[PDB]
């Protein structure tokens, strides 16, 4: 029954509308959901605007009048210029009158603020269409009507606020360059009279709601108005004194003063400098006397969260950091301004103690600005020594966990480290003293806690590389000592664990110290090995992460024979590796082997490096040899989940070591390569035999997933070596051909759900590194993966997401390195190739879309380089206009905004081909256009017709003007893009001005 409002042949029952509306907003469940769908169908009726005048005069529901104005908004912004001029004036008149009538009724004005705001916004939409050209008296009449009534005056401030927003803050996306400039110039021309009204209301007015609205409009004005209106009118005194005392006006006033702290200012006028000093002085005085003194506990205040305290302290932080980043130099020389400078910074110190991550980052960004300036600028740091001393404590005490899952925490640690490093350079002694002192209160239990000892250890670790080696030495020793005694002092389990982790973290951050103290370094490592047998949760993971961390930094000291030692320490690690790693999980074993690989790669003697390599790999190589014997014997073993897991861990170990050693890993790869690819084939047969015997569900089972893990790790190992290989002759002549024989046919002839996308990734690396040397191999790759993978991904944008991504990375690199492989494609296959590229255009998926556009661009450049030959001439004849129109489609369809820049580049390249006469043959049929017509004339003609049918609501003049500008600007990307953006605005409405495309 609620569906009756959807019948326009009858008069609209306003009472029925109000029931649908009430059911939607105040109702629930099915009733609400039904009214929602009805109201949506109502609002979207293209005649619904005609019934807006009824609703606005005769409804009693504010939500109904709001929805009526939404309907009007759609009409005004999209179809305004289609109306007969009678309806435009009529709509304008009964919007103006509805606002005046609401402002005159004090009760409605007070209680229907939502509906008045919506009406003002609607009025603003009309102004964007009609003002000033068809409404030159709007601003003069607004200024006159303001004095007749406080309610109307207050509402006119709302109207001006929204107008300034629509013209200056939100126009870049919503209107053409020409229309935006027109409205900006129009507001700028009449602002003298706007400012006069605003200044009088502020100087004289006493209505709080009127003052607040006027200041809220001023905030918008400060985004664009010239500086003279601010520095030559005494308004700074009003803002920084009168309006900071009242809490009603204090929030907006502070936001205004923050913006003022960014006005365009000449840096040489002495008075402007004094005015800038003065409004800061006034503002800080009002805060100290009306809000809270410099000594106030802002952390406690913020935690209590009374009234608007939190927003005020946020706004204060923004004001102080903004002003001081630009202007603190004005306060640093005059001795009478020193108290102001330091009180402002003392407020910031107190604000920096608040528990609020995002506010802390705001203050921390300022501190970085400051301490970096004190580090470089002569004679400045002594001014801030007491500020900086307090900041050392704030940062040390709020240090967050370093990476050593949470990237916001990781970014915050790095920012904290940066400021604390500066602070340490500024006073190394104060920093050491604070840190030693904090540590004493860990030992004496007054500040002991898991968090507090972690925080301090992170701080201590963060300043590595700032002190002198001798002070570092004395410093580091003292810390470790104090940390060791702190560990003994604890009798607990987790207690003893925490202090141990922190100890190993600190030492891991001071490689310079470890490098110069071998005896200590050795003892550190051996204690890590001890910890690799500790079953307590998290210790083993800690030991391994520290081990490789130290190794990356100190590897050279493991590869040389150290005095007092009979062998390089890497040999000692390798000898006992089985014992050392006996209690570790597989992931942690591979990290250990990887760490050993880093060391071994430092040995530059080839024969010693290879010996170390084969020693390191002795255990996995023996397990490997055993399995290749007892698994080739009875292939049934590979169904034993335990053997499958063992196999995967052997290969994972080779991956880990190959990751560290890269080119140097080749000897170990050669030991397993041929049998590894045979294992790849055997595992492949089992997966296939399992899918045949159980169905596609087999691919979800642990057995088959374990078998595919083997295949994936084999591919990853090959990928890892080839991407780092330095001897490419061996890659091409030893590795590639066995590899392709092993993986390509197996991929082609498996059912879709059994194909590994890692095959494509592996082939991408092969083509990347040696693609230029294996043209026949690249052709074979395409033959084996191109069509069968395309058929997997060309039915929707969702299935087989990994194949989708890797597929277009493979085509991208083939198109880069071995374009000849696409020349060899049969015409039907090269056509699938074009289809595949355009298919990529239409993905919202950024990983696919970006490569699709790059392949298109690279393909055009590949074709262009061929010159005037039959393949290029056929390409342009067959596909030039497909690429033009497909690019235009994603540019204009509103679902591919993220690719705008590369779409524009592609479109500019295509148009420039024609207007540089780089296409040698006619793009048209011998029939459809007179003999001798230039491709330029035919392109302009094809596109005009294309756009006329795709966007039929555009005038022939709009299209013709747009294309003229576009073709003129095909050598100027940024202007080209502006013209495309202008087009995107115009296609959203009726009656766009074709002269807009002359903006540039």
């Amino acid at each position: 029954s609620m569906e009756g409002i959807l019948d326009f042949s009858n008069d609209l029952d306003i009472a029925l509308l109000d029931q649908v509306v009430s059911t939607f907003y105040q109702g629930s469940g099915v009733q609400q959901k039904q009214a929602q769908e009805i109201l949506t169908k109502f609002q979207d009726n293209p005649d619904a605007w005609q019934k807006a005048d009824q609703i606005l005069q005769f409804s009693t529901n504010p939500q109904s009048k709001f929805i009526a104005l939404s309907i009007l908004d759609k009409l005004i912004t999209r179809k305004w210029k289609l109306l007969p001029n009678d309806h435009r004036i009529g709509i304008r008149n009964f919007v103006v009158g509805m606002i005046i009538s609401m402002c005159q009724d004090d009760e409605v004005f007070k209680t229907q603020k939502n509906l008045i705001n919506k009406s003002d916004l609607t009025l603003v939409q009309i102004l964007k269409q009609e003002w000033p050209q068809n409404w030159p008296e709007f601003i003069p009449e607004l200024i006159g009507s303001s004095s007749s009534s406080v309610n109307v005056c207050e509402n006119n401030m709302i109207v001006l606020k929204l107008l300034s927003e629509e013209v200056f803050d939100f126009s870049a996306e919503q209107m053409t360059q020409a229309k935006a400039l027109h409205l900006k110039n129009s507001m700028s021309k009449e602002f003298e009279q706007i400012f006069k009204l605003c200044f009088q209301v502020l100087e004289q007015g006493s209505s709080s709601s009127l003052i607040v609205a006027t200041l809220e409009s001023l905030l918008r004005y400060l985004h664009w108005i010239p500086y003279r209106y601010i520095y030559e009118t005494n308004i700074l005194e009003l803002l920084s004194t009168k309006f900071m005392t009242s809490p009603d006006t204090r929030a907006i006033t502070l936001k205004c003063l923050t913006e003022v702290s960014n006005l365009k200012i000449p840096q040489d006028n002495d008075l402007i400098k004094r005015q800038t000093v003065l409004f800061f002085q006034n503002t800080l005085q009002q805060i100290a006397t009306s809000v809270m003194p410099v000594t106030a506990d802002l952390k406690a205040t913020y935690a209590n969260a009374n009234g608007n305290d939190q927003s005020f302290l946020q706004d204060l932080a923004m004001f102080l950091t903004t002003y001081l980043a630009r202007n603190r130099a004005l306060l640093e020389s005059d001795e009478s301004l020193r108290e102001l400078l330091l009180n402002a910074h003392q407020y910031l110190i107190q604000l920096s103690k608040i528990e609020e991550r995002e506010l802390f980052k705001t203050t921390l960004d300022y501190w970085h600005n400051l301490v970096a300036d004190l580090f470089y600028e002569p004679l400045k740091k002594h001014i801030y020594e007491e500020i900086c001393s307090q900041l050392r404590l704030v940062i040390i005490e709020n240090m967050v966990r370093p990476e050593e899952k949470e990237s916001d925490t990781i970014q915050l640690y790095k920012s904290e480290r940066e400021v604390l490093v500066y602070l340490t350079h500024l006073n190394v002694i104060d920093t050491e003293e604070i840190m030693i002192s904090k540590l004493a209160r860990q030992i004496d239990g007054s500040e002991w806690s898991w968090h507090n000892i972690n925080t301090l250890s992170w701080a201590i670790g963060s300043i590595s590389g700032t002190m002198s080696e001798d002070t570092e030495k004395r410093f580091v020793v003292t810390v470790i000592k104090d940390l060791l005694g702190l560990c003994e002092q604890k009798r607990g389990k987790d207690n003893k664990a925490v202090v141990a982790s922190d100890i190993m973290y600190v030492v891991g951050q001071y490689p310079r110290f470890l490098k110069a103290h071998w005896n200590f370094l050795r003892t550190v490592i051996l204690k890590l090995f001890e910890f690799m047998h500790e079953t307590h949760e998290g210790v083993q993971d800690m030991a391994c992460d520290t081990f490789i961390k130290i190794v990356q930094k100190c590897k050279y000291h493991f590869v040389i024979q150290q005095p007092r030692e009979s062998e390089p320490f890497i040999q000692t690690i390798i000898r006992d590796i089985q014992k050392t790693t006996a209690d570790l999980q597989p992931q942690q074993v591979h990290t250990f082997y990887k760490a050993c690989g880093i060391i071994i790669s430092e040995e530059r003697s080839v024969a010693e490096r290879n010996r170390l390599l084969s020693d390191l790999m002795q255990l996995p190589n023996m397990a490997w040899d055993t399995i290749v014997e007892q698994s080739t014997a009875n292939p049934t073993l590979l169904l034993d989940s335990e053997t499958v897991k063992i196999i995967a861990n052997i290969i994972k170990t080779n991956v880990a070591v190959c990751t560290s050693m890269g080119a140097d890993f080749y000897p170990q790869l050669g030991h397993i390569y041929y049998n590894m690819l045979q294992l790849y084939r055997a595992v492949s047969s089992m997966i296939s035999a399992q899918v045949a015997a159980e169905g596609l569900i087999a691919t979800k089972t642990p057995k088959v997933r374990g078998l595919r893990t083997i295949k994936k790790e084999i591919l990853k190992l090959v990928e890892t070596y080839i991407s780092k290989a330095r001897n490419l002759d061996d890659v091409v002549k030893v590795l590639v051909e066995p590899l392709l024989n092993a993986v390509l046919e197996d991929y082609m002839n498996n059912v879709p759900d059994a194909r590994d996308a890692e095959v494509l990734n592996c082939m991408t690396t092969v083509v990347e590194k040696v693609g230029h040397m294996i043209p026949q191999g690249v052709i074979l790759i395409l033959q084996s993966v191109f069509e069968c993978t395309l058929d997997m991904i060309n039915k929707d944008f969702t299935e087989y997401p990994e194949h989708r991504v890797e597929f277009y990375k493979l085509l991208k690199v083939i198109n880069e390195k071995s374009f000849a492989a696409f020349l060899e494609l049969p015409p039907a296959a090269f056509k699938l190739f074009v289809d595949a590229i355009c298919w990529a255009f239409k993905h919202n998926n950024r990983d696919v879309e970006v490569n699709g556009l790059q392949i298109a661009l690279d393909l055009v450049k590949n074709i262009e380089r061929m010159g005037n030959v039959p393949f290029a001439n056929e390409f342009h004849k067959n596909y030039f206009f497909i690429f033009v129109s497909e690019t235009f489609f994603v540019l204009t369809d509103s679902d591919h905004k993220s690719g705008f820049s590369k779409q524009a580049l592609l479109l500019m390249k295509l148009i420039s081909l024609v207007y540089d006469n780089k296409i040698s043959v006619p793009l048209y049929q011998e029939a459809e256009v007179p003999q001798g017509t230039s491709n330029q004339v035919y392109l302009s003609q094809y596109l005009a017709n294309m756009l006329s049918n795709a966007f039929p609501h555009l005038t022939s003049e709009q299209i013709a003007s747009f294309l003229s500008a576009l073709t003129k600007q095909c050598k100027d990307l940024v202007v080209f893009k502006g013209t495309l953006r202008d087009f995107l605005v115009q296609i959203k409405e009726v009656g766009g001005d074709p002269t807009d495309y002359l903006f540039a």
Binding site: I480, K481, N519, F520, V524, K527
Partner: peptide, 12 residues
């Protein structure tokens, strides 16, 4: 040489 620290470290 930091004999003292290495010994304190070994005994953790």
């Amino acid at each position: 040489d930091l004999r003292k620290l290495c010994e304190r470290l070994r005994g953790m």
